[PDB]
Write a protein that binds this ligand. Structure first.
Ligand SMILES: Nc1nc2cc[nH]c2c(=O)[nH]1
Length: 267
């Protein structure tokens, strides 16, 4: 066995409800952030520069309403889905650097088959493969159910890259993005609430694209005041500017490490 297995969080699309979903998201958030290091009341993700391999990844066990199981590997430093496991085969996205590649080799070391995609796992690449943009890809418990099915069957011959990519895009938003933004969590919650399945509107997309920007601004903000007005998008697509972190507090839940903690008065 591998010395100390990474924490595993489970979820199932079977009898999934708003409650179970909320629990899942809160659990993920709790495993990502150590609780400590919060800038302007918002918790920050662990700094990779000094983060040991053992406390680098979080496993997410996704099960279908038809005995299908798949396990995603979440990068604790940015809630980035690095890869997944199905049956006895592990698939990882092409790393952007040797450092991460070195870390990736520690995932699912007990599988018989390991494969590394030539393409990256970032939205821009995935959308090209899926032949569909996020704004045209539906989200919800249903789509998620189908997503798990595709991912699992990839290791058996189903393959179909367009579908495979689409599945990833779905899982990422419903898990990673949901844990990142309390707002996105709500969107998914409403969808599950009414057994709905719909594509994400502008406001959601913009947030996903601006996660890094926001994290930076909030950390380099003079006591909450942003150094420059950040433009965001509304549900109808209309743009608006944000000047203070206060407005974003109930929206964003987690931020990626950017600036080094100043006098850390952690009390
Ligand atoms: N792999 C991957 N993970 C995440 C997590 C948030 N956004 C993304 C993304 O675009 N790709």
């Amino acid at each position: 066995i591998f010395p100390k297995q990474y924490p595993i969080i489970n979820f199932t699309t079977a009898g999934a409800t708003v409650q179970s979903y909320t629990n899942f998201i809160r659990a993920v958030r709790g495993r990502l952030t150590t609780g400590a290091d919060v800038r302007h009341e918002i918790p920050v993700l662990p700094n990779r520069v000094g983060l040991p391999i053992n406390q680098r990844f979080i496993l997410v066990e996704l099960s279908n309403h038809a005995e299908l199981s798949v396990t995603l590997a979440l990068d604790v430093t940015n809630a980035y889905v690095v890869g997944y496991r199905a049956g006895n085969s592990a698939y990882f996205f092409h790393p952007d650097n040797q450092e991460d590649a070195e870390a990736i080799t520690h995932l699912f070391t007990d599988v018989q088959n390991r494969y590394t995609f030539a393409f990256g796992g970032n939205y821009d690449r995935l959308e090209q493969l899926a032949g569909n943009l996020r704004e045209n890809i539906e989200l919800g418990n249903g789509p998620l159910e189908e997503a798990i099915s595709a991912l699992y069957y990839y290791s058996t011959g189903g393959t179909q890259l367009p579908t495979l990519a689409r599945s990833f895009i779905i899982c990422i938003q419903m898990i990673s993005e949901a844990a990142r933004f309390q707002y996105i969590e709500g969107e998914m919650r409403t969808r599950i609430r009414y057994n709905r399945r719909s594509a994400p509107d502008p406001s959601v997309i913009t947030l996903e694209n601006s996660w890094g920007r926001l994290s930076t601004a909030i950390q380099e903000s003079n006591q909450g005041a942003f150094a420059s007005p950040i433009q965001l998008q509304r549900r109808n697509g209309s743009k608006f500017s944000v000047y203070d972190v206060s407005i974003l507090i109930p929206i964003i839940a987690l931020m990626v490490y950017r600036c080094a903690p100043p006098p850390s008065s952690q009390f």
